[PDB]
Amino acid sequence: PNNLDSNVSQIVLKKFLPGFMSDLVLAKTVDRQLLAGEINSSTGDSVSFKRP
Amino acid sequence: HQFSSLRTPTGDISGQNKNNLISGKATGRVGNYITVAVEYQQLEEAIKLNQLE
Structure with missing residues (x-):
């Protein structure tokens, strides 16, 4: 008939399945040198550049 | 502390109150x-x- 075995234990292995990712290329291409380190404690929260 | 003196002829002060010590x-x-x-x-x-x- 029925056995109903409770000897076993439901273990969870210490492994993580792979996930998903995306690519970051827009940050690399856009200009970063002009704005690099131009906002500091003596400027506030805004900096400006002249126009031709 | 402070004290007071007595002026008597013969120096016998029987029956007179003495100094009291108060702190x-x-x-x-x-x-x-x-x-x-x-x-x-x-x-x-x-x-x-x-x-x-």
Whole structure:
């Protein structure tokens, strides 16, 4: 008939399945040198550049 | 302490009260204390606070 075995234990292995990712290329291409380190404690929260 | 004297002819002071010893004290105690406190944000010191000292 029925056995109903409770000897076993439901273990969870210490492994993580792979996930998903995306690519970051827009940050690399856009200009970063002009704005690099131009906002500091003596400027506030805004900096400006002249126009031709 | 302080004391007082007696002026008698023969020096016998029978039946007269003598000096009484009384002790007094002066008390000193502490009081409220002086507190100065300030506060500021994080970006406030990041982009707006210079020469803090």
